């Protein structure tokens, strides 16, 4: 049923620079990454592990929809993979029915990291929407990871 992309990066940054900002310190992260897309971000329940509830608030205007609600998945501190499935908005507005981003990274060196992206999803249309193919959602995290390096090697 479930369908996958994969794509990866190398951004010139230490791994647990970038893992802690991907985990315990996405809510406050995201925000100063992505000022003219992501409003803020609230932990609603849980610790960082599986079954933890965020909401994004995005700046309306951009998207076609003003937030999304995700829930961890898959949190490993010894491969530093973490999994956010999408419980509501996001996507599902945009045609798909389904909708999950896993990053796992892996040291090259001391400042240049490998992330891999899997990109799980799934839509009831017999044809997939234009919008929300994951070679164009990929662009997106891929935006978004390219952010981050420059974020925190400032
Ligand atoms: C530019 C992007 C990329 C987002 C969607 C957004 O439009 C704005 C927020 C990004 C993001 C930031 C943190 C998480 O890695 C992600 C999966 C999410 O929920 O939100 C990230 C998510 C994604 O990679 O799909």
């Not at 929809?65 to 491969?79: A, F, G």
């Amino acid at each position: 049923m479930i369908k996958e992309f994969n794509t990866q990066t190398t951004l010139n940054v230490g791994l647990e620079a970038l893992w802690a900002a991907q985990s315990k310190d996405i809510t406050l992260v995201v925000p100063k990454v992505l000022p003219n897309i992501v409003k803020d971000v609230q932990v609603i329940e849980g610790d960082g592990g599986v079954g933890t509830k965020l909401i994004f608030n995005f700046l309306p205007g951009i998207a076609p929809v003003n937030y999304q609600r995700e829930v961890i998945t898959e949190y490993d501190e010894l491969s530093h993979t973490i999994g956010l499935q999408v419980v509501e908005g996001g996507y599902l507005n945009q045609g798909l029915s389904y909708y999950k981003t896993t990053f796992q990274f892996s040291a090259i060196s001391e400042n240049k990291t490998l992330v891999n992206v899997k990109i799980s999803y799934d839509h009831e249309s017999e044809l997939i929407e234009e919008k929300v193919k994951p070679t164009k959602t990929s662009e997106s995290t891929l935006f978004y990871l390219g952010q981050l390096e420059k974020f925190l090697l400032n």
